[PDB]
Design a protein around this ligand. Sequence first.
Ligand code: LI8
Ligand code: CL
Length: 276
Amino acid sequence: PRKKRPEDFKFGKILGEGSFSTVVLARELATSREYAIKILEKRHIIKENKVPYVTRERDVMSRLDHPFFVKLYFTFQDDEKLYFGLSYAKNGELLKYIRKIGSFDETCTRFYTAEIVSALEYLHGKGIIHRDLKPENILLNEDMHIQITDFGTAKVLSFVGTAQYVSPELLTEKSACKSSDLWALGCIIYQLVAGLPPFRAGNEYLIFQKIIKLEYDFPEKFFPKARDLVEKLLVLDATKRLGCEEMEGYGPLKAHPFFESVTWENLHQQTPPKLT
Ligand SMILES: CC(C)(C(N)=O)C(=O)NCCCNc1nc(Nc2cccc(NC(=O)N3CCCC3)c2)ncc1Br
Ligand SMILES: [Cl-]
């Protein structure tokens, strides 16, 4: 089809700024479609030795075809920049709703947790480890269904993701795996229900000390079935986390009492519960 150029677009406001990128809202002049265009500067990529990560990311986004992930429509580059045309997730980051509404009720916690597990099942199925899952990476579309992004740092089957969602193995033998993603899910489930991440401290080194020592507590408010699930994900021994291959995969995880009423088969077709 048509190989796109910057002039083919009417760029608008900035949707997000990373250390190596800026996602900008663009409207395609010929169709009026809105896209979230990720813009990367070749110079900064090179001098910062990031080529391996930019290639990785595009190559993962090529292999993914599922509704809970931001899609890559096209790419193009100019003299000093690379451009990736991605799905524009209208409602933005999930972190905003957590902060906006405070915390989630059980219905919302279960529906959104189910969408995350279904998306992890898919990703793990292609042999890709996100390695940096967090509420800032999980977006909500026009219909409030999740749309996961930020794959520059994924591992296809070195680094350390956001301090509070990093698992123990990384802080030790520095090696992450599929269970690293499950650790982050436990952290995120806790965060949805409590309104706050489980391992938190004044500084990063302190956050790390807690993680390795598994120093965190559950508020009395915490729904008990969600709590039982969180204790099955927040495990130091990665071969013991509900969801990993040694624990027989997603079947047992999906079969958790917390998910009793979920219909796993058509979630994105389902009307998400109203965030209150
Ligand atoms: C990877 C990274 C760091 C980036 N900037 O490249 C990134 O932030 N990705 C997610 C957001 C941008 N990408 C994207 N953002 C949206 N949608 C969207 C729509 C409205 C608001 C926001 N942004 C926020 O809510 N933010 C909270 C405060 C600042 C952003 C994001 N859709 C697709 C992408 Br790809
Ligand atoms: Cl992004």
